Amino acid sequence: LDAALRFQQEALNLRAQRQEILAANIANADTPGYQARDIDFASELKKVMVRGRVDLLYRVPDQPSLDGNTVDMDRERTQFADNSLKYQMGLTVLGSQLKGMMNVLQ
């Protein structure tokens, strides 16, 4: 066995990937015609649980800009904060499972 950590491990990996995506968003917040992207965390987590080892959907824009850029910075800031917090949560949950598994053991 020892696939009892699989769910949170894959969730934490997808959280890291989403962090990378959102950092790319922030970085390209000025390049003309960027068409900000994102991924759907729930659907991708379910997809990686059912099969194992991610389509880049387009964040639906508000507020056009004539440079084609659609990174609306406020949404990206909120989503980046949410993703960082969820990543830290996943760290704590995995830590608790490993603490428990090594507490029962010795």
Partner: protein
Amino acid sequence: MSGVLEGSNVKPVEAMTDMIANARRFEMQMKVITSVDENEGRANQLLSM
């Protein structure tokens, strides 16, 4: 009509009011720019921790 020259039709009163309007419009835009800058400054603290 000979013996006569013709000058410029630059109405000075509309030019004066246009310049006053331009100055005031410019400084309203400057206030908008200042507020937007300082907003982005405040907001860039969400990403910490």
